[PDB]
């Protein structure tokens, strides 16, 4: 079931077989579609598709033209693209792209929604030089999207002995898995060993969303999106365990501008921004936004963390 | 100012 948008002149149309495209981690799905024109009244003799990542500053930009068919531009039709053309007839001409990896998913900033945008612009012109007329173009928005590694990432865990008291104060953070599903109850199964001569008033259970961005330089910021503070004292020379529970939800941050969401198509309010996955083992220079979570648990004196990736499950 | 992104199924 394919989306359609027609220009203000009404003769021009673009098709996309879907507006959210998956990343396999190794390669990111390329776009496919069809651009429609009236050849019988089209003396311009040309058409363009431009696929652009747009941070509300463009990033990766590419120009393709299904019409007039350039034999040097032939890529074999996708089954959906041919299923479209065979339904449209001789006046319709396919296109397909190659989105390079290193390009983020569509994730956005909490208030057109700022953040990256994939903006399929189909327009008509005799050559690229002339400005695009408003009556002569269409503008489909879409998303690159990212999903859980299906193999369960083996148990993450952290620890730290923090001396003041020759006896140690020590804690462990153990959680079911690094890859989490949005809305799933987080089971914070922490433990602390306090042999020391000092007490603790509160243990602070929370989640924070880091936000990597590379636009002017490499830049970073973070926002708490889950929280529970317990007055649970652990006395000197005493040990403690308690399975705390948390989940992140946007409602209690609606006022916290800048928190990341997954891409708003037009003006949606879909779930918080999913944490993305880097390519390769190296710190490759992926564009745009990288966001990730860490569970922060701290004993207030009288700090333990663990990375996790709360991101949507691979849709069935 | 008044386009529409409204579906078709081949």
């Amino acid at each position, epitope marked *: 079931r394919v989306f359609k948008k027609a220009s203000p002149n009404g003769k021009l149309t673009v098709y996309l077989g879907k507006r959210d495209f998956v990343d396999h981690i190794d390669l990111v799905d390329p776009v496919d579609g069809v651009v429609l024109v009236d050849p019988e009244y089209l003396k311009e003799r040309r058409v363009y598709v431009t696929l652009t990542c747009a941070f509300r500053k463009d990033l990766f930009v590419a120009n393709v033209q299904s019409f007039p068919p350039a034999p040097e531009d032939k890529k074999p039709l996708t089954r959906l693209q041919e299923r479209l053309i065979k339904k449209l007839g001789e006046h319709a001409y396919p296109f397909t792209f190659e989105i390079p990896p290193n390009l983020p998913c569509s994730v956005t900033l909490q208030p057109k929604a700022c953040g990256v945008d994939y903006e399929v612009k189909a327009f008509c012109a005799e050559n690229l030089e002339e400005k695009i007329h408003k009556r002569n173009s269409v503008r489909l928005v879409i998303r690159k999207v990212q999903y859980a590694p299906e193999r369960p990432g083996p148990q993450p865990t952290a620890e730290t002995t923090r001396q003041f008291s020759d006896k140690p104060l020590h804690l462990e953070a153990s959680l079911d898995k690094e890859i989490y599903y*949005h809305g799933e*109850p987080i089971s914070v199964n922490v433990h602390v060993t306090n042999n020391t001569n000092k007490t603790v008033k509160k243990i602070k259970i929370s989640v924070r969303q880091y936000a990597d961005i590379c636009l002017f330089n490499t830049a970073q910021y973070k926002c708490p999106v889950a929280m529970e503070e317990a007055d649970d004292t652990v006395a000197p020379s005493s040990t403690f365990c308690k399975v705390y529970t948390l989940t992140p*939800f946007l*409602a209690n941050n609606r006022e916290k501008r800048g928190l990341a969401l997954d891409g708003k198509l037009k003006h949606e309010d879909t779930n918080l921004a999913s944490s993305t996955l880097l390519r390769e083992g190296a710190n490759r220079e992926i564009l745009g936004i990288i966001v990730s979570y860490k569970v922060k648990v701290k004993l207030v004196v009288s700090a333990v963390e663990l990375p996790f990736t709360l991101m949507h499950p691979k849709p069935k | 100012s008044e386009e529409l992104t409204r579906s078709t199924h081949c």
Partner: antibody, heavy 107, light 102 residues
């Protein structure tokens, strides 16, 4: 991993329906209630999209019903009040979730 | 609000095909359900095609325009149940009047 709702009154009165799940949490989903008069179809009355925190109500209950979610015990409640004669039905709580249909149900 | 209606009200291994239609453009955002006497309903199909887990394969969602359809490839002896078709793009949601079968 299962749902139940629990909790006769004179017209103009009220009841609480207590909606209880198990094996899974509330925030994963929006909570709904749905009417069913004997021998007739159902109708969406009220629902709390717990993750969003927003809630919506239907015409046939508008403003007079109210709903809230107790996250602390995986449960939500219907603030039904001032019931009028046609509000007699077998009530259900419901939990969903993208709304791949309304997926979990009580008894 | 969108009214959605179905036919026939009642009818008695034979293949089952049934259809309902919506008063306004709602896309494929239709659900289907079934329910035996006195129980809460069980979800069959979402986005008018996608068979939910565990549901017997004979249940299958179909679409044409704003007319949506369900097919049970056969009427198993366990297939006497209520059924609703329901749109979920707009609030208030609207279940139809549904089918009893025997």
């Amino acid at each position: 991993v299962q749902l139940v709702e629990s909790g006769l009154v004179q017209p103009g009165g009220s009841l609480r329906l207590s909606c209880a799940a198990s094996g899974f949490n509330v925030y994963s989903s929006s909570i709904h209630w749905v009417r069913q008069a004997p021998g007739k179809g159902l109708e969406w009355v009220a629902s709390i999209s717990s993750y969003y925190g927003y809630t919506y109500y239907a015409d046939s209950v508008k403003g007079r019903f109210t709903i809230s979610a107790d996250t602390s015990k995986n449960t939500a409640y219907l603030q039904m009040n001032s019931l009028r004669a046609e509000d007699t039905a077998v009530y259900y709580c419901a939990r969903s979730r993208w709304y791949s249909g309304l997926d979990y149900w009580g008894q | 609000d969108i009214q959605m209606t179905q036919s026939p009200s009642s009818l008695s291994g034979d293949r089952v095909t049934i259809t309902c239609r919506a008063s306004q453009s709602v896309s494929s955002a239709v659900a289907w359900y079934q329910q035996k006497p006195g129980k809460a309903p069980k979800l069959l199909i979402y986005s008018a095609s996608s068979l939910y887990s565990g549901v017997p394969s004979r249940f299958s969602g179909s679409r044409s325009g704003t007319d949506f359809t369900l097919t049970i490839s056969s009427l198993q002896p366990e297939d006497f149940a209520t059924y609703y078709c329901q749109q979920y793009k707009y609030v208030p949601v609207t279940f139809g009047q549904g089918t009893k079968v025997e």
